[PDB]
Ligand binder design. Structure first.
Ligand SMILES: CC(C)S(=O)(=O)NC[C@H](C)c1ccc(-c2ccc([C@@H](C)CNS(=O)(=O)C(C)C)cc2)cc1
Ligand SMILES: N[C@@H](Cn1cc(F)c(=O)[nH]c1=O)C(=O)O
Ligand SMILES: N[C@@H](Cn1cc(F)c(=O)[nH]c1=O)C(=O)O
Lengths: 262, 260
């Protein structure tokens, strides 16, 4: 019979955030954001009840080279702890081999965040100098993009980042933002364009996205391989796209209440 | 195994007839982004294939009366082709009847005008009557307008469906020619990918205006449940991650730009 769907997700703004009065709230009511709204829409169109659960290790999902064990949200799906992931989870080949993904609900590419006034306009620019350090989220699809790239500029960037001291990798997007804001232009952060565009709209309005994106991809709703939820969830994503709901939700969480002007 | 029958469509710069194609044979008759993409997918999946241009020259729509699918979608649904490798938009009604890979290219509906036309947006088009406008007479753009509940787009559809003479065209080439020859009195609604290609082609007399009206993707399609779906999708993800899709886009779009 019908069972409550366990949703794995991650505290990443503005996708899932603690509500102001979270300390006296319980269950799903503790959270707000794009993916909270998206989970409600998907659940409504698919006819299920659900419980939002923040991934224990705070990771997206990577496979350890030695143990072959998956961590993060991907791990929660692979090992049967969650029924679905509704999060800014990038569709990647290695993940697609072990979990199912809907068609993407949001587009993005790796991008560059600078402190305003930093003399950098492109990845090439970063790669041709050493005064400004740069890095990525310490686990996830961005780091993997650099590790795997055969493109010379990106390989050069990876060769620098992997050996940089102190480490240029950060544990959370928030840590990356802090490092940009505090480093007087001497750190630049490589992060997904969606997060970058969100942060550019937040006080104190001291960061900006520069240059084109380094790649082009999408976030997808993920389920364990072969789950019966996969098909209706995908149809729901396509419906929400075609109805304009995904556009409305992006505007709601990114731009409608932006803090850095119009 | 056997030779995979690929349905596709003549649409620049995805599939085009080569110069001197009349003395060429088979796959060698054709060139373009989807020709290259088909070669890459087939190499990764280890199959031989035959490119075939869809008989009716359509993308795929379901007749409201007979419920029969035409175009490339129809070729898959009725067992005439094994796979479609083309700028085929992923849509809900199609996803219900065929399988799609993850998308290989992003696009949105967009506006093409003859340069100097006093139009900057869909809202602009919707608020006037001097300039006619239309879409490809079958496909996802037409369906977008037919189904939209957004006020500006519904207003546009209400005009287009009843316009006389017809504002709909059989091919993109026909829509572009109509823009070019109508002295600013016809604007064309078409996918941003095609728009951006045409904008950089002689005679350089058209431009894209405004933002895109939606955001979606093209996918590789197979008959529902086909065993080809899984390896083809993995191939699309590999080509994406390797930077090959970007290389192919750069090759077929901005490399052949003729307008500076
Ligand atoms: C891993 C890659 C193969 S990928 O990310 O899946 N695709 C790569 C390719 C360059 C690309 C990248 C991004 C997009 C893209 C386009 C639209 C969207 C959303 C708004 C809608 N997705 S959809 O499938 O078209 C829709 C009908 C629901 C999300 C992603 C489309 C194509
Ligand atoms: N979406 C990524 C995780 N992720 C998140 C970010 F904000 C970022 O900048 N880079 C990144 O890899 C994934 O799914 O691994
Ligand atoms: N990709 C569409 C077909 N298609 C092509 C175009 F060039 C266009 O402008 N509009 C459109 O619907 C589909 O798959 O129906």
């Amino acid at each position: 019979a019908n069972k409550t769907v366990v949703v794995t997700t991650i505290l990443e703004s503005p996708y899932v955030m603690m509500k102001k009065n979270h300390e006296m709230l319980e269950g799903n009511e503790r959270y707000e954001g794009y993916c909270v709204d998206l989970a409600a829409e998907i659940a409504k169109h698919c006819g299920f009840k659900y419980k939002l659960t923040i991934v224990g290790d705070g990771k997206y999902g990577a496979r350890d080279a030695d143990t072959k064990i998956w961590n993060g949200m991907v791990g929660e799906l692979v090992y049967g702890k969650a029924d679905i992931a509704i999060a800014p989870l990038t569709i990647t080949l290695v993940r697609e081999e072990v979990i199912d993904f809907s068609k993407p609900f949001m587009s993005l590419g790796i991008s560059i965040m600078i402190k305003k006034g930093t003399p950098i306009e492109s990845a090439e620019d970063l790669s041709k100098q050493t005064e400004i350090a740069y890095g990525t989220l310490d686990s996830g699809s961005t780091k993997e993009f650099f590790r795997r790239s055969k493109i010379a500029v990106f390989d050069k960037m990876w060769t620098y980042m992997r050996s940089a001291e102190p480490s240029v990798f950060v544990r959370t997007t928030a840590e990356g933002v802090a490092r940009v804001r505090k480093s007087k232009g001497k750190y630049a952060y490589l992060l997904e364009s969606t997060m970058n565009e969100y942060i550019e709209q937040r006080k104190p309005c001291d960061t900006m996205k520069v240059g084109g994106n380094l790649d082009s991809k999408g976030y997808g709703i993920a389920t364990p391989k072969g789950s019966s939820l996969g098909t209706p969830v995908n149809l729901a994503v396509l419906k929400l796209s075609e109805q304009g709901v995904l556009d409305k939700l992006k505007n709601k969480w990114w731009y409608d209440k932006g803090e850095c002007g119009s």
